């Protein structure tokens, strides 16, 4: 019921000296633009109704 509250995002946790920022972010935007987000939205999220 209702609207959302404290609208934020779910993401990856990494250390500041961890050099795995940028290429990981590249892969992430690839996942956002290539429908893999929608792929998981089908394969795990959108099936079920009462």
């Amino acid at each position: 019921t209702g609207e959302l509250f404290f609208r934020s995002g779910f993401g990856i946790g990494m250390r500041k000296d961890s050099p795995w920022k940028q290429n990981v972010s590249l892969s992430i935007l690839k996942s956002h633009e290539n429908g893999f987000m929608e792929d998981l939205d089908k394969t795990w999220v959108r099936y079920q109704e009462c």
Partner: protein
């Protein structure tokens, strides 16, 4: 938990649905996030008459 296990050296990767916060970002940086979500409210279906 998770944050102390990163800052303790025992854990090295968080890949799990964490929210984004000030104080968490003060020490451990996020990437750009997967899903843009938040809070909803569980209210039951009351039984019919």
């Amino acid at each position: 938990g998770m944050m102390g296990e990163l800052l303790s050296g025992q854990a090295d990767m968080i890949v799990a649905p964490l929210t984004i916060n000030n104080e968490r970002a003060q020490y451990i940086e996020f990437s750009k996030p997967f899903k843009y979500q938040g809070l909803t409210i569980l209210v039951k279906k009351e039984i019919p008459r």
